[PDB]
């Protein structure tokens, strides 16, 4: 009846978020390219919550028109939450990057996120109980060597979302906007970012959250009054906080 | 024989930079859409410096292919400096924006700048005497109400450029990357951002630099060892300094 839209639902944080919210009886619109994985997730959602309605959207969100079309197709649904989670990364020096991939990364991590945020805001700003959650990274607040382009995309996500969140608050909007900033999380991110499958976090990363743990944090952020949900890089504690960037409003 | 590439040369900061560097006897590649204004600038550059060679590129940089084709066409030139100055803004709430314009803004402010930075770095990283200068904004370090999307584009430019600059330094590169962050500057920026010609800074803005003053700052940043050239929002003093963002390298 009321729906949560999750982009990048087919694996990782998005997948676990779907499973967690199914635990709360929510209906879901699950968006990704991998139809097969979406269908697997759907089965798992329905096992957790038989009365959850699930809508699958097999869509490449790296195309701006595809994003517009996606949103237009939801017009007959009551969306209470929209989660802009689809995204990927890259490891390489700038002088070494493949522009096809980096261009796509800009279209996905920045453009698709801006298009859906904008369209959601346009027709949810005055609707009670609505929430926009954009997924940045701790890398959207502090730069990581060998990941400059990706970090920059997340600085965009962080600044955009903090700006939007404060615009809505100050303008008396009913819509709330939030930003999740994970650190290391065990998903397919490293595999896609290095361009080779089967990275093992247990044998390569000293500190990381599971995707299930990150989904829990995401849920805590939604239910909170805080704008920012960020993992501390030193302690790996999850912190609900106010905007981190300077704001001239 | 050695060239400075200036994007957005047809008005504002870019225009004044061309005239200043002409004063230094430099040769120029001037890029923009307005052929007529490019030719006017060319006349003025030649009046300042008859021995400066001037190459004009009438190009819409909001199309990624056009940016690639632009760069490939300079292959026979010796580029010592590339300035990613083309860009525009918008004033409006997120819920009120026009997606065509904001989509274009992402393609120009973010994508064209990334493409040219990446391409320049690819074949200049080890070349003595080369400089990349990306034009951000004071709004790429502090968020301005009613300009959230644009500010996010400039947080991208700031983080990308600081990240790149540090990557190059840490890696022993000969190439130097810099970021200029103007505050209010008397250009066509307000006209294009409100979608309304004829804005008068003298009667509407308490503090602003002229485009000529900002060109001078730009020149000081190139000659400096500093990564960041930023205008103080309270004093409007120009400061040469190091990265502002948290960096983990």
Domain borders along chain B are 2-241
CA distances, A95 to each of A74, A190, B175, B225 (Å): 41, 20, 11, 21
Max Cα-Cα span within chain B: 51
Residues in a beta bridge with B79: B3
Nearest CA in chain B to A94: B118
Contacts of A119 in chain B (CB under 8 A): 99
Closest CA to A140 of A159, A163, A112: A159
B25 sits in the region (left: phi over 0; alpha: psi -120 to 50; else beta) called left
Using the beta-carbon criterion (under 8 Å), do A167 and B94 form an inter-chain contact? yes
Closest CA to B131 of B117, B111, B141, B112: B117
Residues in a beta bridge with A240: A229
- The answer to whether the beta carbons of residues A29 and A75 sit under 8 Å apart is no
Contacts of A99 in chain B (CB under 8 A): 68, 115, 118-119
Structure tokens, A87:
């995204």
Cα separation, A141 vs B29, whole angstroms: 35
Structure tokens, B29:
């590649």
Residues 6+ apart with CB under 8 A from B155: A155, A156, A158, A159, A160, A245, B140, B141
Cα separation, B64 vs B108, whole angstroms: 9
Contacts of B246 in chain A (CB under 8 A): 141-143
Of A115, A143, A156, the CB nearest to B245: A143
In the 8-state DSSP scheme, what is residue A204? Answer: T
CB atoms closer than 10 angstroms to residue B19: 18
- The answer to whether the beta carbons of residues B133 and B222 sit under 8 Å apart is yes
Tell me, yes or no, if A93 comes closer than 8 A to chain B by beta carbon.
yes
Cα separation, B184 vs A137, whole angstroms: 31
Contacts of A71 in chain B (CB under 8 A): none
Please, what is the Cα angle at B175 between B170 and B181, to 5 degrees? 90
- The answer to whether the beta carbons of residues A74 and A29 sit under 8 Å apart is yes
HEC string for A46-73? HHHCCCCCEEEEECCCCCHHHHHHHHHC
Residues in a beta bridge with B240: B229
Instruction: Give the CATH fold of the A2-241 domain.
Output: Rossmann fold (3.40.50)
Structure tokens, B30:
């001037």
A42 min Cα distance to partner chain B (Å): 32
Residue A109 labelled as part of a binding site: no
HEC string for A88-116? CCCCCCHHHCCHHHHHHHHHHHHHHHHHH
CB atoms closer than 10 angstroms to residue B98: 12
Cα separation, A61 vs A77, whole angstroms: 20
How was this entry determined? X-ray
Closest CA to A53 of A116, A4, A120, A124: A4
> Which residue shows structure tokens 């024989």?
B1
Cα separation, A183 vs A160, whole angstroms: 19
Using the beta-carbon criterion (under 8 Å), do A94 and B164 form an inter-chain contact? yes
Using the beta-carbon criterion (under 8 Å), do B149 and A143 form an inter-chain contact? no
Structure tokens, A137:
């990274």
The CA-based dihedral angle spanning residues A185, A188, A193, A197, taken in that order and rounded to the nearest 10 degrees: 130
Positive or negative, the CA dihedral A37, A38, A42, A48 is positive
Cα separation, A168 vs A174, whole angstroms: 8
- The answer to whether the beta carbons of residues A246 and A225 sit under 8 Å apart is no
Cα separation, A193 vs A147, whole angstroms: 9
Q: Are strands A238-241 and A228-231 parallel, antiparallel or unpaired?
A: antiparallel
Residues 6+ apart with CB under 8 A from A123: none
User: At A41, which helix (H) or strand (E)?
Assistant: helix A35-48
């Amino acid at each position: 009846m009321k729906y949560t839209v999750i982009t990048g639902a087919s694996s990782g944080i998005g997948y676990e978020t779907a499973k967690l919210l199914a635990g709360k009886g929510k209906s879901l619109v699950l968006v990704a390219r991998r139809t097969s994985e979406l269908e697997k997730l759907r089965d798992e959602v329905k096992q957790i919550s038989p009365d959850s309605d699930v809508i699958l959207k097999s869509v490449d969100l790296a195309d701006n028109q595809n994003v517009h079309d996606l949103y237009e197709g939801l017009k007959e649904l009551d969306i209470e939450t929209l989660i802009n989670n689809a995204g990927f990364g890259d490891f390489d020096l700038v002088q070494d990057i493949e522009l096809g991939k980096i261009e796509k990364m800009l279209r996905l991590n920045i453009e698709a996120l801006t298009i859906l945020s904008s369209l959601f805001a346009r027709d949810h700003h005055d609707i009670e109980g609505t929430t926009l959650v954009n997924i940045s990274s701790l890398g959207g607040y502090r730069i990581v060597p060998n990941a400059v382009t990706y970090c920059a995309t997340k600085f965009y996500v962080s600044a955009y979302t903090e700006g939007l969140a404060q615009e809505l608050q100050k303008g008396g909007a009913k819509l709330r906007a939030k930003v999740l900033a994970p650190a290391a999380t065990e998903t397919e991110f490293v595999d896609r970012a290095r361009g080779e499958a089967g990275f093992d976090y247990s044998k390569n990363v000293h500190k990381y959250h599971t995707a299930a743990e990150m989904a829990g944090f995401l849920h805590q952020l939604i239910e909170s009054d805080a704008i920012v949900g960020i993992v501390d890089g030193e302690t790996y504690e999850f912190e609900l906080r106010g905007p981190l960037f300077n704001y001239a409003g």
